[PDB]
Amino acid sequence: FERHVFKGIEHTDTGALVSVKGSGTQEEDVPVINSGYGFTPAADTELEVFLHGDGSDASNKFATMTIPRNKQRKWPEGAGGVQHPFNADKFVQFDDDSIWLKDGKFTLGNNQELTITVSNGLVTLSSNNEVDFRCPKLMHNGVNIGDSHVHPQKPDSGGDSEEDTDPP
């Protein structure tokens, strides 16, 4: 085991290769053993890479990368989760209940077709196409605003009485 810093990163079709230094070993190091999290630093980013050596056969060394120490989130007691590699204030946190996604902007879809923005308390749900609610009841503050809502009407200028409107 040996800690080395980080220079570059070559991405081949069998996985990621690092290029760690500490001793310019491997212009292309065997891996990054991905246990489901990954990231791409800019070249020469100040982070540590730990090499685990097969047998003691220097020959092959597998790498574990750490996110930069000064970018690590100080998780509260009882909580945990996943963060942005370079930003301790962007994360998905599991707490006592809040599956909490901390950012100002969230995108969903294969091409980011739904955008949720949260800025100065305004919540905006943006799409370039139709947004359709599929439920038996769609409400605002416990009032029906769905495909069955109606408006009461006042009497006209003649003094004739209106029914409620039909639905949308």
Q: What is the C-alpha to C-alpha distance for residues 29 and 18, in angstroms, rounded to an integer?
A: 5
* 71 three-state secondary structure: helix
How far apart are CB 64 and a copy of itself at their closest, in Å? 6
**How many CA atoms within 13 Å lie on the side-chain side of 57?**
6
How far apart are CB 98 and a copy of itself at their closest, in Å? 5
Closer residue to a copy of itself (CB): 27 or 62:
62
Closer residue to a copy of itself (CB): 27 or 100:
100
The two structure tokens encoding residue 79: 């909580």
C-beta separation of 17 from 31 below 8 A: yes
How far apart are CB 24 and a copy of itself at their closest, in Å? 18
Q: What is the C-alpha to C-alpha distance for residues 30 and 51, in angstroms, rounded to an integer?
A: 10
Closer residue to a copy of itself (CB): 27 or 126:
126
The two structure tokens encoding residue 73: 């989130």
C-beta separation of 60 from 44 below 8 A: no
Closer residue to a copy of itself (CB): 7 or 73:
73
149 labelled binding-site residue: yes
How far apart are CB 42 and a copy of itself at their closest, in Å? 6
* Annotated binding residues for Fe(3+): 149, 151
Binding site membership: which residues? 149, 151
